[PDB]
Every structure is written in structure tokens, then in C-alpha cells.
Write a protein that binds this ligand. Structure first.
Ligand code: SAL
Ligand code: SAL
Ligand code: MG
Ligand code: MG
Lengths: 408, 411
């Protein structure tokens, strides 16, 4: 039921308003051009806890515990539920969803593995209008702790060269001196970036926001698309510098090899769920501009096989190859061996599910805060040809996409 | 034309021998051989020919009514008029396109060789062999590949230095190996084929010029509105045991120099196809997998597209040719570097062989091939030179490739 219809550069500020006017209440914001989506409150929720041992459903009638033998079956059950079907669903998928779904052992973090929410209220910004439906920057030193990171990379490089795996994303968490103003970081960060999706979610005393550089996955009807980005240079100088960096990226043998290794894995992943011969690269290794950095990017698509749904596709595609590694399960393991803080939502997914689409954005270029931690996180794809010093610099170039725009 | 069908109760072992035995009987008549599995098409004589001379200044139609001079304002239009000729419609057409067709099309200045730029021929008689049946329509040289390796190395060095100066990104530098004698074509076909796994095989004789070879890649295939191109680039040997070969395969697939050399050419192929296709129809159906080609294995990708309404197979061919994998990047600068660096005309080397029928426009790249005319008898092979290339490796590469033809040349 459409409540109001008030008649674009005011979209940004309005969302902030909404987040503040109704702060300390649960909110989910998602940008998928030409629209913004803001959901508020909670009419139904599926919550999977940090170690994947409890699935909780909540709606107005109360709380239920659902059998959690398969998180994907829980997600399917939620989407088919009477309180849910026909409604837009805002979701989040933590990094360790992969290990849980994969029968890989893992150490649980603090954040949920998966949540899906039908909001009580919803604003939609489109065609210089909004539709309502109802029932002070901070300085961040991104060099600190550099040497420990380069050791982690040198370890990864040793493991690859020994043949333990081919690629792994090693990331570093940078703790922030104070909690940040999320609505103001959103506004200020956004104008600094050209992301494929933006998001801000506040739920159960935990907050995350970011400018997603790529899609994990998009499903429209029977067509599945994934969008691996891998291979990076800065775009942090004048146009001349940036354009020389673009040509350099296109012709650098290390960056190109990093890229193609991931596209070929993304092809094999889609092949596991798609009709034979339907998997094609629609865009091969073009440069994508993402704020402080520009990347090689490819679009791969296929047609889901008859016995495969968007959740089967999501479990194979998750996490992005470009945020985990190759082969995926060995990389996931190396990540849990090498990294010392839980990724939580970092390298996970933000979801928007509605009548026409399953949309899943990769969680990078993002900032996170709960009762215990406030941090940003960036990594780099490590291959046999990686240099620890260059990969450090790469994380810093990526961190410059979010870090300068953290408002206190 | 009158036709006859024969079932030969011949074992597989004897099929290739029978074909080259028939070729033997065509003695010194003009003829055209093309293998596109499951068939071998042999054409004999000439009923109708389009001839484009070496400098691209004269187009001639020839049939039983005599010679007619056509306007060379557009080779593509000439080729279109020939296909639409009453003499031609409904017949398989055997074509050859010389390296210099590129430069000419692109209004780049070239030095003409002696071979025609392009010819298309409807033969007078035809034989089609397919799995032991035939349909008729009627009315050991020793070659040292190391010799002169030093001169080639300097050509590679010069290309590399030119790339490092930013003149172009990639160029194929090739070397011609003069041969001691004229070769026996039917015996070369027979021995050379069973040692190769080419996309197409060919042999032609026309107006005192001959060529034969085992094409490793298809410039282009068009059936109806769908155009496929299959760029190959990046090489290792497969001259050893299956475990040596499997090692070389994994090594090819993960070598950053080879992977870059491959993808640079694929993206050029994609951009070329996009100029003549429906927006969004150009996709990569097969990304960078290993293809086995006799003495060598290569990375190949399969790219496809849907032709736009204002464009035909002739339009696709003009943009797709020569193979980026035979010229360079950017194409025009690479064609200029090849003309300044190489000392002999390529003629048909790195050109195309065409088989055109009702359904299809099939074009195979001329590499792994042998040429002979009134003046020269030679083989030829090159290598894709990028910033990372070393002259020693690239010489070795030309020799790995030459080994698909050199060992099988018969007198
Ligand atoms: O390492 C990269 O080049 C990269 C770029 C974009 C997204 C994820 C990545 O690992
Ligand atoms: O240089 C190569 O590896 C190559 C391989 C196949 C065809 C053309 C080529 O240049
Ligand atoms: Mg990288
Ligand atoms: Mg090569």
C-alpha cells in the first residue's frame, strides 16, 4: 500500500535524514541505479547465527527455530513463507557462510552468517521522486602494521610456489580510533566513488556500509551473471597519470594473469549450475573505474539448469573468487590459517531479492562497527608472481576508496 | 554438371592414401584440395575465376565468355559480384587471399609481391571424399631449421626494442626457409597430414603457383548470420611423450608471457567483431583453452557474434583479416613494422584459404604451410613478439612450429 508520493541530488541527503530522523532503529539501504532502496524495521526475519548452529525465524506472531542442516534450505523456506513471498528482501551473508555450506571447519566470528529481512516500511527513490510504502572526517593511517601484512603475503607466496594452491586473497583489518557517523560517511563516501552497488545496513547493534565494486551474482529469471574484478592500479593522480595507469594495467602480465585465472574459475563455477554450452564471457577484461582504484573486470553469464535455483548458484559463486581464491576451498582454508581477525561481513555479500531479481553485491570498500570493533578492511589477490611490497600498496590504494571519507 | 556416387569398400587406413593418389592424377592441372572433416573437397580446373592482381589495381572475371575487367573500387564488392554470378551461384568456391590484402583494404601502402591479392575459383570438376565414399561432378627433404637463426634473432630484438620504445604492442615476425628443391605435393599431403591435427588442410595449384599446409586456426566461419573467429596465440611444444606434453600444456596455461600474448589477441578479435555485429552478440564461448596442433599446442579462444543487418561475411572477413595472431597490435602499425622488418614477400603466408558454399563462408589461416612458384620454394613461420619476448625463445618457437611441416616435405 503506497502511502505517499513526493516529487535526485536530494536523494542522498533524504536517506541520511531518514537514517537520523529514525536512528537507533533497524534500517537497510541499497543503491541499484537508477534507484535507491531504504527498508526500515522488520516484519519477518531469518537469522542464522555466527557458527551456523541455530536458524531463527521471526515475524509478528513470534519466534521459531528452524532446522539448520542447510542454510540454503532455510533461505528457500524464508523466501516461500507467506509473510515474505511477493516482498522485497534485504540480506547479508557473512564470509563463513562459505565454510559452513562447504563442510569446511571454521572458527566462528561474532556476526550472523546470514540474515534476510522483510522491512516494515520501505522508501523507493526513482524518477526524481520518492515512494513510501507501509503496513568532521577522521584521519586513518593505512600504513600502520604494514610489515606484519607483508609477512602474511610472503607466507601466501611460499604456499603457492609449493603448489598448495594458485591464488589467495590476504586482507588486513585497520581498527578506527572512534565510531563513525554512518549516514554522513554514506553521503561523503558516495560522491567519491562509482560503485556497482552501495549499501548501509543497521541491525542488532551492528552496522556496515560500503561501495561495492562488483556483483557476486545477479539472477533474472533463468539468466545468471557473475562479475569477477581482479587486477588493480590506482586512479589517484591527474587524468594523465590515471590513463597511463590504465594502459599499464591492461598490459601488465601479472595483472592480466591474476585476472584470467579468476575469470576461468568463474566460468567453471557457472558451468556447475548452468545448461551445457550456455556459459559465455560477455565482456572480457575491460577496465572498471572504482574511486581510488581501477580494475580489470569481466562479465560471465549462463542459463541455470532445470534442477538449479538462484540459491544453488549463490552457494557455488560465494564468496567471490576474487575475494577468496583458487581453488576456492583451499584458499578458504589458507585464509583461516593466515588471517588473525574474523572477516565477519568483509568479502561477504549484500542481497536484494524481489520479483524480477536475486542481486548480490560483494562486500569490499566497506566499513563495519559493532559493540566491540570499528574497522575497515582491504586485501589483495596473491598469486605466485606477487611481491609483498606491491600488495601492501595495493590494499592502501583500495583503502583510499573508503578511509578518507570516514565521518566522526 | 553430371554426378556419380561411389562406395569404396576401403579401410580407414587407405582413405588418405586414396585422396593423395587421386591428386597425383591431376598431374599439372590447376586443382584445389580442402579438408573440413568429415569431407575432403577436391576441385580440378577452372570454370569461373575472380582474380585480383598483386598490387590490388586490377580485378578480372574469367569464364567461357572470356575475360572481363571489373572495377577494383571495392574487392569485397568484386567478390560479392562473383558469388552472385549465374556461373557461380549454387557451387562451392575455392579461394586464396594473400597477406597484402590487409594493407590494401586499409589504405596502407605495401610493397607488392608476385602472387595475386585474392582469387576465387569454381572448378570444372569436383570430387568429395567422405568416410570411404566419393561423389564426383564432371562434364624426404632434409631441412635445417636452425640455419640463419642468427638473422631472425636480430629481427626479434629489433621488434622488442621497437615495442619498448612504444611503437606498437605486438608484432608477428616471421622467417622464410628457402628449400633445396620443389616438393612432391600428394606425398607431402599424405605424410604431413597424418602427423598433424589441423583445423583445415589445403593444397592448391593455380597459374604456376602452389601451396599446401595444415592450418592451425580458422580466420572465420559464417553460417547464415552467425560469425565465429578462433584466435590462437601462445605456444609450447607437444613433440614428446604424453607426460612431457601434459607438462607443457599446464606450463602454457599458467605462463604470464603466454597468457598475455593470448588475451591481447583475443581482445583485438572481439573489438574487430563488434564493428560488424549486433551490440551484445559478441561473446567468448571458449576462453583460453589448449589446442593440440601436430608439433605444437596453443592457447585458443572461441569468439562468436551476430552479424548486423548492414553487414555480410565479406564485411566480417575484411575486419577479421589478417589474423591479429599473424599481424599485430595495433594492426596498422604492426603491418607497417612487418613490411620494414621482413625482407621477402609473405605472399600467401599468413593469408587465408576459403571454401564458400551455400550455407557457409569458411576461412582458414595459412600457417604451417609450404609454398613454391617459378622463382622460390619455401616454408615460413613466425612468432608473436611482445615486450616480454626473448630472441632465443622466439627462434626456438619458430622451429617448434616448422616441425609440423619441415619433416614431411617429400620429393
Ligand atoms: O586483487 C585485485 O586486483 C582485486 C581487485 C578487485 C576486487 C578484488 C581483488 O582481489
Ligand atoms: O606466437 C604464437 O604463439 C602463435 C601461435 C599460433 C598462431 C599464431 C601465433 O603467433
Ligand atoms: Mg590484485
Ligand atoms: Mg608465441
Amino acid at each position: 500500500k503506497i502511502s505517499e508520493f513526493l516529487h535526485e541530488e536530494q536523494w542522498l541527503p533524504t536517506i541520511s535524514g531518514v537514517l537520523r530522523q529514525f536512528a537507533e532503529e533497524e534500517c537497510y539501504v541499497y543503491e541499484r541505479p537508477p534507484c535507491w532502496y531504504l527498508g526500515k524495521g522488520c516484519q519477518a526475519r531469518l537469522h542464522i547465527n555466527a557458527d551456523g548452529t541455530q536458524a531463527t525465524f521471526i515475524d509478528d506472531a513470534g519466534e521459531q527455530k528452524w532446522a539448520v542442516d542447510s542454510i540454503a534450505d532455510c533461505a528457500r523456506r524464508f523466501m516461500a513463507h507467506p509473510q515474505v513471498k511477493g516482498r522485497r528482501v534485504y540480506g547479508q551473508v557473512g564470509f563463513n557462510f562459505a565454510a559452513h555450506a562447504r563442510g569446511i571447519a571454521f572458527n566462528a566470528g561474532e556476526w550472523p552468517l546470514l540474515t534476510l529481512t522483510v522491512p516494515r516500511e520501505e522508501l523507493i527513490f526513482e524518477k526524481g521522486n520518492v515512494t513510501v510504502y507501509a503496513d568532521a572526517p577522521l584521519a586513518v593511517d593505512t600504513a600502520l602494521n604494514g610489515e606484519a601484512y607483508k609477512q602474511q603475503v610472503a607466507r601466501a607466496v611460499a604456499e603457492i610456489r609449493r603448489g598448495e594452491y594458485v591464488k589467495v586473497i590476504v586482507s588486513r583489518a585497520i581498527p578506527l580510533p572512534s565510531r563513525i557517523d554512518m549516514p554522513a560517511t554514506l553521503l561523503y563516501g558516495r560522491q567519491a566513488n562509482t560503485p556497482v552497488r552501495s549499501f548501509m545496513f543497521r541491525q542488532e547493534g551492528r552496522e556496515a556500509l560500503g561501495f561495492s565494486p562488483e556483483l557476486v551474482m545477479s539472477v533474472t529469471g533463468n539468466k545468471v551473471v557473475t562479475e569477477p574484478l581482479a587486477g588493480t592500479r590506482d586512479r589517484m593522480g591527474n587524468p594523465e597519470h590515471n590513463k597511463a595507469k590504465e594502459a599499464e594495467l591492461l598490459h601488465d602480465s601479472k595483472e592480466v594473469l591474476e585476472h584470467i585465472l579468476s575469470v576461468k574459475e568463474a566460468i567453471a563455477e557457472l558451468e556447475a549450475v548452468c545448461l551445457p554450452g550456455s556459459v559465455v564471457v560477455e565482456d572480457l577484461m575491460s577496465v572498471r573505474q572504482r574511486g581510488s582504484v581501477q580494475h580489470l573486470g569481466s562479465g560471465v553469464s549462463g542459463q541455470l539448469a532445470e534442477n538449479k535455483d538462484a540459491w544453488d548458484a549463490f552457494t557455488v559463486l560465494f564468496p567471490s573468487i576474487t575475494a577468496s581464491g583458487i581453488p576456492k576451498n583451499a584458499a578458504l582454508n589458507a585464509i583461516m590459517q593466515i588471517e588473525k581477525t574474523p572477516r565477519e561481513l568483509y568479502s561477504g555479500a549484500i542481497l536484494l531479492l524481489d520479483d524480477t531479481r536475486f542481486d548480490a553485491a560483494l562486500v569490499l570498500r566497506s566499513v563495519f562497527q559493532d559493540s566491540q570493533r570499528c574497522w575497515i578492511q582491504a586485501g589483495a589477490g596473491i598469486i605466485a608472481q606477487s611481491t609483498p611490497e606491491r600488495e601492501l600498496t595495493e590494499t592502501r590504494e583500495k583503502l583510499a576508496s573508503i578511509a578518507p571519507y570516514l565521518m566522526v
